[model samples]
Target: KLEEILKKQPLYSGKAKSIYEIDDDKVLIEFRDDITAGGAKHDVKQGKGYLNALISSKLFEALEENGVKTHYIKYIEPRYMIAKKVEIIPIEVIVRNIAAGSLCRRYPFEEGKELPFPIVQFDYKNDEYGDPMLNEDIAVALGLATREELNKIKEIALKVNEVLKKLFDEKGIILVDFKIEIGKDREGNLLVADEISPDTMRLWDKETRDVLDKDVFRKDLGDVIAKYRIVAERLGLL
Candidate 1:
C-alpha cells in the first residue's frame, strides 16, 4: 500500500514509527497514529501521526538554525521525514524545566515547581532493564560511550532545552521537560536524532496549565488528537 511512498516495507517499527531505507545515507521515517503509555495503555488517534511529523520537523529546523546539529533533512506531508541515517546511541538524554512526571515520582521534587536550573540526566536505553538511570562512570565502563561523549550528550540536551523552552514560552506554552536521542553520524559527529513532539515533550498551556502533549491520552483527559491539533496551531502550523 505504501509502495508509492516507500520503496519497501519498514526496516523497523516501534510503538508509533516505521523506518524505511531511502538511500545509503538517508532514511524515511513514518510516524504512525499509534499512541501508548506505561507500556500498557495504547490507542490509535487519527491525525496524531501527521501532527507529530509537522511539530518535530519545525522544532528540528529551529534547533538547526540555532547552532544545534540534527539529522533532519526534510519533512513530507501527512507523516514522513527524510532524515540522515546514523547510528543511534543507546542513551536517552532528559532535560527538565519544571518539576513534573518521573522527576516527582522518583525524587522529592514537588510537581510543577520550577527547578532552580535545568537538570540534565541520562537514562540507559534498555527496555529489558526498564531504562534505568545512567551515570558517566558506569556508562563509560559499559562502553555505551566515552565520558567525553556522555558529557557532550548532556551539553546538547541542555542546549535543546534552552532553544525549545524560549520558543514554547513565547507561544504561551510551558516546556516542562523532554527526552531526546543522540546519534553518531558517518563523520563521527553527534547529531540530535529521533522525533520531537508532544509525545516526547511535556507541554502545558501556560495560561491554563492544560496538558497539551501525550498526557492527554496517558491521563485520559479528552480528545487526544484535538489536543495535538492545539499544539500544532499553537506553533502556528495550523
Candidate 2:
C-alpha cells in the first residue's frame, strides 16, 4: 500500500528527488524543494517541487497524446509522481532547436540564435567524469547502449522535440532546448523517464522573449516560483 511504502526508507534519495519502491513494477518519485546549478550550487525553494510536479505531469500527458511512451503513471498533488519501474539508461539525451548555453561556449554557436535544425546530443551521465559528450560508438564501447538502441534514442529525441516544440509554440512559448532520459522496462520496451519541467527545459516567451524557465533561477533574473507560476497559468495547469 502507498502508506506502507511511505514509511520505508527511500530506495534512492537524490539531491532534488527521492525514489520509493512501491512494488516490483512501480515506484513513487517525490520531487523535493532542492534545486541545483552547475551540479554544485544548490538551494531550497519553497514551492519549486510542487510547481515542477505539476508542470512535468502536464508535459508528460501532452507527450502521451502525441504517441510517445513514458514511465509516467500519475501525479500526486504537491510533489509526487507514481511511475513505472525500469532500468534507467545512464545517458542524458539533449535536444536543441536553438543555440544557447554550452552550445555557444563549446562550438561558437551564437547564443539565442535558432539552429538550422534540431540537434540531438548525448552525454554520459557520469558526474565524476563531468558528463562528457558521448558519440554513438563511444557509448557502445562504454557499454552504455547498443547501436540499435542509440539510433532509436535519436529518433525518439527528434520526435520529442517535434511534439514539445509545437506544444509550447501553441502556448506562445518557444521550446529552445531540453534534456531527457530513457529507461528500459523489464519487457524490453524503451520509455521516456524522469521529469521534464522548467528545470529541464529552456522556454522563452514568443513575443517578449522573456525567459520563463530555470534560467530565472540559474541567472538570478527574478523569483523562480513566480516565473513557474507564469508558465503554469499560460499552460492552463494552474
Candidate 3:
C-alpha cells in the first residue's frame, strides 16, 4: 500500500514519532489516533500515527491551493496519510496569540488578555538547553541560520499565521497561536516544513471558545475521537 503511493518519491525516514519517510526530503506522518489526552493514551488507538498523517495531508493541500509555497505534502492512497517532499530546517519558530499557560507562568501576564502583538520566539534545537527561546541576534551568533534566511522565515511565519487563523475562523474556530519550522532548499530559499495540526495550534469553537485540541487532555474529555472528527470534518479531511 505504501509503495503504490510513494513510488515516485525517494524515502528517508525521520526521527519524528508516528512519522515515516516516503520521499527523501519529505515525510509521511501519522498522528496517533488514540487520544493524546494528558499526553498519555495507553488505551488509545493502535496506529495513532494516522492522526498526524491526516492533518498533514489536509493542511498541505490547503496551503498549496492557497498558493502558499510549502514543503509540498500531498495525500496519497492511505485513508490517514500524506506524502511530503520537504527540506527541513533546524530552527524552531514559535508564535503566540493570547497569554497562555507557559508564557503567563514565565512572563507574568494577566490571564486571557490578548497580546498587543504576537510574540515571535526562536529556540535553539539543542535538547540540552531545552529549546530555550533566543533573540534573532543570538540565533545568528549561534550559527544556526543566516541573517537573510532568518528574515525570510519571519515572513513565512506571518503568512502561516494569516492563513491558519482565516481557515479556522471560517469554521467558527479561533486559531489562538501555533509554532512553525522552516527549511532551506539547495538554492537558499526557505519553505515551511513543519506539521500544523491541532497538536501545534490552539483551536477553539469561536462562540464557545471551548478548548478543542490539547484541552481534551486537560479536561479529561473522553470523546477524543469525536472531537478529532469534528475538526477533521470541518477541514473536509477524508
Candidate 4:
C-alpha cells in the first residue's frame, strides 16, 4: 500500500512530513522520523515517525470532535495519514500559553511565567529566510493571507489552544504552546493542516514539570521515545 502510493513523486515535502496526492481532493501525509533543532541538530530513530503519526491521528480526531476543522481524514498506517488536500498557506500560526522556548529567549519573560491569555503569533513560512516573524499587517501586505483569512486563522487557533489545553490537562500535561499550518480547501474554506504531535507542541508534565514532548530530544534530557510513550500511556493511546 505504501509503495503503491509512493510510486508517484510527492507533491510536497517539508521538515517532518511529505505530501503525496491521492486524488483531486485528498492526499497522503507521510510522517518522517527525522527530528531537528535550529534546523541543524538532526537525527532519525526507528519508530519515532510512527509514534508521531499515532499521536497526530488521535489529536486530530479529538480536534474534529471539538468542532475544529482539519485536513486529517484517516490513519492509513503507522507513518501515513490520508487527508483532505488543501492549498497550504505560507504562514505559520503560533499560540503561546506560557513563557518558554523562543519566547523566553526573545524577551524578558522568565521561563514558566504564565500568561493571562494565549498569544497568537504569525511567521512567514520561508526556510530561506529562517521563517521570519510577521505582524498581521505585514502578513496581509505580503499577500500571504488576507485580513479576513488572518482573522479566521487567529480565531480558530485560539479555539484550538482552548481545546488542546483542556485535553492535555486531563492527561496531566501542560500544553505550553504549539504551532500550526493552515490551508484552503477547494471550496476556499480554511482548515487546520499538518500534524499535531509532540513535534509541534511544547508539553510538560504537570506534576514534575519535566518536559514530555520533543524538548527531551532538543535539550538532551532523556530518551525521546520513552517520554513519548509516557504521553501515549497517559492519553490511553499506547
Candidate 5:
C-alpha cells in the first residue's frame, strides 16, 4: 500500500529494502516499518520500529524547512515512514560532540567525555576499509566531492551542530552526538540526506540523564514503549 506513493512519483523501480528512483531533477526513497530484531555488536536491536520512523520523518521535515535544500520529501499521511527522491552525494559527514562507542574503542579515550570540539570525521563509506576515517584532502583526492563542495559540507555540518544541539537540549535531551548524510540537489545544493531519530543520535533524558535512544533496548533496560512515549511527548507529539 505504501509503495503506491512512490509508484506514482517520477521515480520508483528496483531497490533493496524499499524502492528508489529519480528523474527530471528529483529524488525519491521509501522506508519499511518492519523490525530488525536482536542485538549486534553495534549497539542494540531496533525496537518496535517507532524510533526509526519517528526520527526519520521528523528530521526530514525539519531539514526541509531549515533553509536547507534536500530531495523533496513532503510527508505521507497516516504512515510511519518518509519518501524522498534526492540527489545523491557520495559523502558521509559525522559530527561528534561526545566520546563514545567505536570512537572510544579506537582512540583509547575515556568514555562519555565531551570531545575537544565537535569533531567532523569523514569516512569512505566503503565496506573494505571497514568505513575507515579520512580527511577532506583524501576525499577530494579520491574524487568524492570538489574542494568547494567539501567546504560547503563543513559549513552545513557546523550549522547542524548548532541547530540539532539546541533543538534536543530544549527537550532536556542532551544531544551527545549524531551523524548526518547529505547529498546535492539537482541545482548542486548540499542538504541533509538521512533519517534522524533515536537511531541516529545519542539521546539522554534531561533530569535523569537516562539513555532514551536504542541504548535502552540494547542494554535490556525494559519499558521500550514507555520510552517512546516520553520521546514523542518531548517532541510535542501530544
Candidate 6:
C-alpha cells in the first residue's frame, strides 16, 4: 500500500533523501546512505539511512508529544517516513547550546565551551552560495521569509531546542547544536519540516564528550553507523 501510494519517480531529491509525492497533501521521504561535508567528500555508507530514519522518527515523535508542530506523519519503514507536504522555507534554523562545528571555525570560541544561553541563528539554504549566514534583514530582503515568519521560526526553533536538550540530557548526551528547516503547510501554518537525525544534529556524550553524530563521518572518527546505532539504542529506538 505504501509503494502503491507513492509516485513512480521522486518529486525532488537531495544529498541524503528523496521525496516522492504520495498525493496532493502528503509525501514519502526516503533517507539515503549518501553523506557529504564542505559540499564535497560525498560517499554512500550502507545502513546509514536506516539509522538516521529511525533516529529521526523517534525524535520527531518526541517533539510532537512535547507540543512542537512538525510535518512528520509516521515511519513507513526503516528508511522511509510519511509526512505532510509543505512549502519549505529556504532557511536553516540552527540552535546552539555549545560552541562546535562551523560556530567554532567561524568564530573565536573554543569547541565544547558552554554557551551563555541557547543561540538561534539562521542561514540562507542555498548550496551554490555556500548557505551564507543571514540576519533577519537579509532573509527578508531575499524574500525567503518575512519578519513575522522569521520570528515564528525562532520561537519554534528555540522551543524545539528546549525539548530536545532536556531529552538528550536525560540520556547522558549533550545537544551541542542542531539545524532545522521549517515550512508552511497549505493552511499557512508553520511546521518543522525536515528530519531530525544525527545527520542534522550534533550530539556528544555528556561525560566522555565523544562525538556521536555526523562528525564521525565528517572527521574520519570511525564507524558512523556503529555510533549512530549507539545513539538509537540510547534513545530507546532500537
Task: In model 2, state the lDDT of residue 238.
Answer: 85
Measured on C-alpha atoms, candidate 4 has an lDDT of 0.89
Model 4, residue pairs in steric clash: none
Residue lDDT tens for model 6, 76-171:
776999999999999999999999888999999988999999999999989789889999999999999889999999999999999999999999
- State the weakest 10-residue window (summed lDDT) of model 1: 1-10
Please state every model's RMSD to the true fold in angstroms. 1.6, 1.0, 3.7, 1.3, 4.0, 1.1
C-alpha root-mean-square deviation, candidate 3 = 3.7
lDDT of each: 0.92, 0.91, 0.65, 0.89, 0.63, 0.91
Model 6: how far is 11 from its true place, Å? 0.2
Q: Is candidate 2 or candidate 4 better by lDDT?
A: 2
lDDT of 3 by residue, 101-145 (tens): 568778889866788877777667666667777788988888888
Query: What is the RMSD, in Å, between candidate 6 and the native fold over all Cα?
Result: 1.1
Q: Which ten residues in a row have the lowest lDDT in candidate 3?
A: 8-17
Tens-place lDDT digits, model 5, residues 1-238: 2445465643433211244444455444444433222323232233334545555566566655676555446544333344444555655677888887668888887888877888787767765566677788899889888988888888888777777787788988887877677776556667676566665577778788787765665566766546755777788754
Q: How many times do residue backbones clash in model 2?
A: 0
Residue 139's lDDT in candidate 2: 100
Q: Each model's TM-score? A: 0.97, 0.97, 0.80, 0.96, 0.79, 0.97
Tell me the tens digit of each residue's lDDT in model 1 across 165-236: 999999999999999999988899999999999999999999989999998898999887888888899899
Tens digit per residue, CA lDDT, model 2, 61-131:
98999999999999988899998998999999999999987899999899999999999999999988999
Clashes of each: 0, 0, 15, 0, 6, 0
* Cand. 2 TM to true fold: 0.97
- Give me candidate 5's TM-score against the actual structure: 0.79
